[PDB]
Amino acid sequence: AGGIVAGIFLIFIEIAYKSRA
Amino acid sequence: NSAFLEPFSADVWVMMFVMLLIVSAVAVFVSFTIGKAIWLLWGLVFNNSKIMVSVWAFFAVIFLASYTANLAAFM
């Protein structure tokens, strides 16, 4: 659960970085 | 001369089902498509967005190997 939540946060940060690029 | 379900103690099944439900909800956020999502989760469970599925697959593989060793040992 914690890895899924942090995984969702990491996916959110990665997607936001890709969107910023 | 039921050990298969005994090794899981029925708790592992419910835990994996709830975790697969949360992971399938996260994957769905990322009708029959959800069924294919659960089909993918259970597909990983028996060992036959991308990063989460990869880690989930690794954890499912480790869980599968552990389940196999513990089931053999218990048997």
Experimental method: X-ray
| CA quadruple B35, B39, B42, B47: dihedral, nearest 10 | -170
Spatial distance between the Cα atoms of B52 and A19, rounded to a whole number of angstroms: 19
Ordered by start, the domain boundaries in chain B are: 2-75
Q: Which residue numbers of B have CB closer than 8 Å to A's CBs?
A: 19, 22-23, 26, 30, 49, 51-52, 55, 59
Q: How far is B19 from chain A (nearest CA, A)?
A: 7
Radius of gyration of chain B (CA): 14
- Measured between beta carbons, which residues in chain B are less than 8 angstroms from residue A7? 26, 51-52, 55
User: Are B41 and B23 a contacting pair, CB within 8 Å?
Assistant: yes
Q: Give the torsion sign (CA, B30, B35, B36, B41).
A: positive
Of B50, B73, B70, B42, nearest to A10 by C-alpha is B50
